[PDB]
């Protein structure tokens, strides 16, 4: 269990990057290459939060 808890926590922390958190996409380069600054800096703000 000591090994498995750390392995499961690291796997969960790795798999958490796929979530959008309300943004239109989970890819920062896609957001930056698709949108302007004034809304890119609130979509990336949501992703960073």
């Amino acid at each position: 269990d000591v090994v498995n808890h750390n392995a499961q926590a690291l796997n969960t922390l790795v798999k958490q990057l796929s979530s959008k958190f309300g943004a239109i996409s989970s890819v920062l380069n896609d957001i930056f290459s698709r949108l302007d600054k004034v809304e890119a800096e609130v979509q990336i703000d949501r992703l960073i939060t």
């Binding site: 896609d30 290459s33 698709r34």
Partner: protein
């Protein structure tokens, strides 16, 4: 009136998909760099990698 005047309206719908693409912009392709860390732009997919 201007609100009653006719308008030509065109809706353009694009397919931003994780798929092979046929329509691209005016900028063109450069030469390939292998086994070296560079910035890259593959069909709008931007990033930094080897």
């Amino acid at each position: 009136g201007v609100g009653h005047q006719p308008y030509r309206v065109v809706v353009l719908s694009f397919e931003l998909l994780h798929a092979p693409a046929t329509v691209c912009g005016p900028k063109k392709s450069t030469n390939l760099v292998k086994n070296k860390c560079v910035n890259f732009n593959f069909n709008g997919l931007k990033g930094t990698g080897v």
